[PDB]
């Protein structure tokens, strides 16, 4: 199916507690494969997926060089943004960046991304044209200007259409037994009286990969969006994810309710009911 690669950078200032921390992690879809942490005893790029371990010394050295350089420039960038917002030296602040490429089911580039945030708010993003920028405010307009002057977009476009896709494709092949394996959810419905006249039906999905899934309840075939309690999809810790959806129903009306499950790993979607 469709696949993506992303790198996530977090640079955090911490006045009085040393220089800003820089962390980078890399993902293919929902699988992390590398990390770098400037706070580590010996900061270097480390593998976090078995299929990446085969990459040679030059790969690891080159990654580590990039992240070490970014550790330094992101410290300067934090200084710059403090100034753009007229902020005091006392506060902690964070720049985040996420960038990468999306492939369609045939393996070709769908689109690229390079987005940054400051203190959790949109700051500047590369447009889908991979040629122009969207700046959130007048501070970000200053960054835009510098980036326009330095032809950053052109460089991002070259990476996103080139190296990004090429490497993603390589990882997909090297990790094909997992990265290209969809594991369907294991499902069941539970029943718990909440009173004499009402009970909870909870529809469970466990052990699935990737994280994307749809879990809905219907009553008499009508979606129950407003009445469904839906927890955020959560990692099990073994690569797989979990989710559930709950509905409180009048006692005696249980068979009027159906749980529906959509997941890439499902030969066909599921319809489930409580089985007393």
């Amino acid at each position: 199916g469709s696949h993506s690669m992303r790198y996530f950078y977090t640079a955090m200032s911490r006045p009085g507690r040393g220089e800003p921390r820089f962390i980078a992690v890399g993902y293919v879809d929902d699988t992390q494969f590398v990390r770098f942490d400037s706070d580590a005893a010996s900061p270097r790029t480390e593998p976090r997926a078995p299929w990446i371990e085969q990459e040679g010394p030059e790969y690891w050295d080159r990654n580590t060089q990039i992240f070490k350089t970014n550790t330094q420039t992101y410290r300067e960038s934090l200084r710059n943004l403090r100034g753009y917002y007229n902020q005091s030296e006392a506060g902690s602040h964070i720049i985040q960046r996420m960038y990468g490429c999306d492939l369609g089911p045939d393996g070709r580039l769908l689109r690229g991304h390079d987005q940054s945030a400051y203190d959790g708010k949109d700051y500047i993003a590369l447009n889908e044209d991979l040629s122009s920028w969207t700046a959130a405010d007048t501070a970000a307009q200053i960054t835009q200007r510098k980036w326009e002057a330095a032809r950053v977009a052109e460089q991002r476009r070259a990476y996103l259409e080139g190296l990004c896709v090429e490497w993603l494709r390589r990882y997909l092949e090297n990790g094909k037994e997992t990265l290209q394996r969809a594991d369907p959810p294991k499902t069941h419905v539970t029943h718990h009286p909440v009173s004499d006249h009402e009970a909870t039906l909870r529809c469970w999905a466990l052990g699935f990969y990737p994280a994307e899934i749809t879990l809905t309840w219907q009553r008499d075939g009508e979606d129950q969006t407003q009445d469904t309690e839906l927890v955020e999809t959560r990692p099990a810790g073994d690569r797989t994810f979990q989710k559930w959806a709950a509905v409180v129903v009048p006692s005696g009306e249980e068979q009027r309710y159906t749980c529906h499950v959509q997941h890439e790993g499902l030969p066909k979607p599921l319809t489930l009911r409580w089985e007393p």
Partner: peptide, 11 residues
């Protein structure tokens, strides 16, 4: 593989 920044890259 991450993108390499140009020298003196800054916000």
């Amino acid at each position: 593989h991450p993108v390499a920044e140009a020298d003196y890259f800054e916000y």
